[PDB]
Amino acid sequence: QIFSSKSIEKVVVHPLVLLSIVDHYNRVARDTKKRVIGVLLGSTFKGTVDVTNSYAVPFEEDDKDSSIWFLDHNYHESMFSMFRRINAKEHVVGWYSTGPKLRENDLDVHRLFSDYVPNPVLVIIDVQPEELGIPTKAYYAVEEVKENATQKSQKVFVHVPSEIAAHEVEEIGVEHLLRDVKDTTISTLATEVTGKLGALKGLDARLREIRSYLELVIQEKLPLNHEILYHLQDVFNLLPNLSVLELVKAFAVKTNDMMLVIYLSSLIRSVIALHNLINNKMLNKE
């Protein structure tokens, strides 16, 4: 009964936020490897963080001393007041980071920021995404009490699902921006086959990465957090036997049924297409 702080179930990240963050990175870090930081504004409902608006909050971090990081609260609270005046519905929800990876001082940023929100969310956005997927990864700090006595309670960032949805107005603007590229005529299969194939490129590469890390453990360079190795062993344990015989007949039956339904569909399309071809011959002769 101690965890009275509503756990953050999911975070919804909308385009305007990403566009603002990208423009911030460009203006502040087009030609430097410095990261740009800011504050996330919105409303939290039923464990879901609606990240509606965000604004630039200038950031420095010494290229020599990562522990040192120039961000200040004057403009922060000034903008809280000013934006809340503009839109009283919104309130601060988190602080965003523009980069591929976390840094240790992200923890102290989260600590300082939680004074403004009891449950703040850290969102890492890769301004130059190379991977095929959502460019946002959500985090919230959890005080994990390790079973080892010699270490004090350490705050560890725990991943939360992050999703991208666009309001009707944002959806309208996005399509208006994406007409020169986007595809709506794709028959659903092309999309689904592409997604499955991309997923296969994902899982097999993930297995290869685990294998690389296992060879690493063999050499004796990197150990592993008991929990994640536990998870890999769990995945292997839940492996169903693909050589299950009655299960094989189950495959055969479903395959026959589905493919003969497809056979129905092909027959009916034959009917209609031949009908229309004959009508075309009629219209051509007349």
Partner: protein, 96 residues
Amino acid sequence: FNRPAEDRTIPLKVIAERTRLSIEDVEYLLMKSLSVHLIEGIIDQMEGTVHVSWVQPRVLGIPQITSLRDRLDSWLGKVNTALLSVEAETPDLVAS
């Protein structure tokens, strides 16, 4: 734990010899360690076999890491042959 997940059926006899313990009492122990939420599974008396849906995940070392190395290389090869089959099938079919 020693057995893979593909052979979570085990005769009650082998359980007895490993446990040196009687058929009735082996079954007693099985239903007890299935009841405590320690395990989840089914047991078939006709042939006297135990279908456990009971598998755990922890406690292993460098040798199991190398074994998973071999297994991951194997499944990388399997994915490779699947992808190569797809890529060899595509040219005659996407060019239409």
